[PDB]
Enzyme design. Structure first.
Site, PDB file in Angstrom:
ATOM      1  N   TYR A 144       0.876  -1.235  -0.084  1.00 18.67           N
ATOM      2  CA  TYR A 144       0.164   0.001  -0.064  1.00 18.67           C
ATOM      3  C   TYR A 144       0.856   1.315   0.064  1.00 18.67           C
ATOM      4  O   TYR A 144       1.163   1.789  -1.048  1.00 18.67           O
ATOM      5  CB  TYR A 144      -1.143   0.105   0.956  1.00 18.67           C
ATOM      6  N   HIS A 148      -8.320   5.041  11.615  1.00 18.40           N
ATOM      7  CA  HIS A 148      -8.324   5.621  10.310  1.00 18.40           C
ATOM      8  C   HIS A 148      -8.321   7.165  10.268  1.00 18.40           C
ATOM      9  O   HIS A 148      -8.960   7.784   9.557  1.00 18.40           O
ATOM     10  CB  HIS A 148      -9.509   5.185   9.634  1.00 18.40           C
TER      11      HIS A 148
HETATM   12 CA   LIG Z   1      -5.042   4.386   9.040  1.00 13.14          CA
END
Ligand SMILES: [Ca+2]
Ligand SMILES: [Ca+2]
Ligand SMILES: [Ca+2]
Ligand SMILES: [Ca+2]
Lengths: 219, 211
Positions: free
Chosen positions: A121, A179
């Site tokens: 990622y 997040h």
């Molecule tokens: Ca995150």
DNA sequence: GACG
DNA sequence: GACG
């Protein structure tokens, strides 16, 4: 033996983006947390979640993406192209690179970036982003390592390896502020502190040049 | 409206080797940049930080040792910062600070607690020794002490506990107290913005703490 | 004061 | 799987 010597500082790194690899996503949030190796070189049960070192450098930035956030990215991260533009956030641009450059320059060299799933990622994505700039990549001279490989390795020596699962398996607690670039980079620092001398050495052994990472997608 | 509407508030906090008498040097610097528009009961719940902030937190090797008092309460010391490889307050720091400022809409206004007596004069002293033009020139600043008085002891902790009926955390880290500052400033955001727009003053007019 |  |  060590392929590139001892990494002098580890840089825990986390990104938020507009979606997953398949959507050729763009960066929306970026956090760096620089730590010198001495910082990494435990009482009770379940093991206390470790305090961050007193001496760390933190860079947390928000980034207008050039494309919309997928609805999925929007609800997990709390961001949107539109709101970042309301708050006048600038894009992933040459000044952002000089900033990264100057930030990286303050750390004892060489650096090793550590991201959770970074190999699939953050690294390749960051690589794609930086390839657009005309400023030289400020990352080309760092090293990287994916903390999923590390945690596997470490737990083995003493199951899900997503960020929260590990953090919860290790500490019997829930991660906070999930997040948000910074939020999850801190949880990442927490699990990397689980066995600092062992992770630190696993890093030295497995560090690899960032410049050998392939971009997620092309221009 | 002397200087128009500040588009960016940058809450600012430092640690240093001591108090003005000792001619301190900076050991830790934290900037928390919040856009104007991310600022537009009983006891009030401690406010949350906006989803969108830019944060920069840096430890800096001072040229003089820390006073025993400064080490005591900050957990820092020249020796530690050094052995851990912290660079001095140098031209690169100036380049970094500036790059960070460049990412915010103008005008930026710095916000610090007792900043008119401490942080601002201190920073100006630190920045006057550099060959780089100061990155803070062209920015604005305000003292959150005057701000909070006008809105209502005025020590950072006193105020937090007085507004939110509970205790602050993580004291005398540049970031710990910068967050605290952020909270009490969002007690009454709109009133705060209006007072800031009104009393903001060009950083470049701040006299050095010392020479 | 109030800042370290 | 795991990253958003
Ligand atoms: Ca995150
Ligand atoms: Ca991540
Ligand atoms: Ca202060
Ligand atoms: Ca403080």
């Amino acid at each position: 033996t060590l392929p590139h010597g001892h990494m002098q500082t580890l840089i825990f790194l986390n990104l938020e983006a507009t979606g997953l690899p398949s959507s050729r996503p763009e960066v929306t949030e970026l956090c760096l947390l620089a730590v010198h190796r001495r910082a990494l070189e435990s009482q009770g049960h379940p093991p206390p979640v470790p305090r961050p070192p007193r001496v760390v450098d933190k860079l947390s930035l928000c980034i207008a993406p050039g494309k919309a956030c997928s609805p999925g990215a929007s609800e997990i991260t709390g961001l949107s192209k539109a709101e970042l533009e309301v708050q006048g956030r600038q894009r992933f641009d040459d000044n952002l690179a000089i900033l990264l450059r100057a930030f990286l320059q303050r750390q004892p060299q060489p650096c090793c970036l550590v991201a959770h799933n970074g190999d699939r990622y953050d690294f390749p994505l960051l690589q794609t982003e930086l390839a657009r700039l005309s400023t030289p990549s400020p990352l080309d001279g760092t090293f990287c390592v994916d903390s999923i490989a590390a945690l596997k390795a470490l737990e083995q020596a003493s199951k899900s390896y997503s960020l929260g699962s590990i953090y919860t398996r290790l500490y019997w607690q829930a991660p906070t502020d999930s997040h948000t670039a910074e939020g999850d980079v801190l949880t990442l620092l927490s699990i990397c502190q689980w066995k600092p001398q062992a992770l630190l050495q696993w890093v030295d052994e497995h560090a690899r040049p960032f410049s050998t990472v392939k971009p997620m997608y092309g221009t």
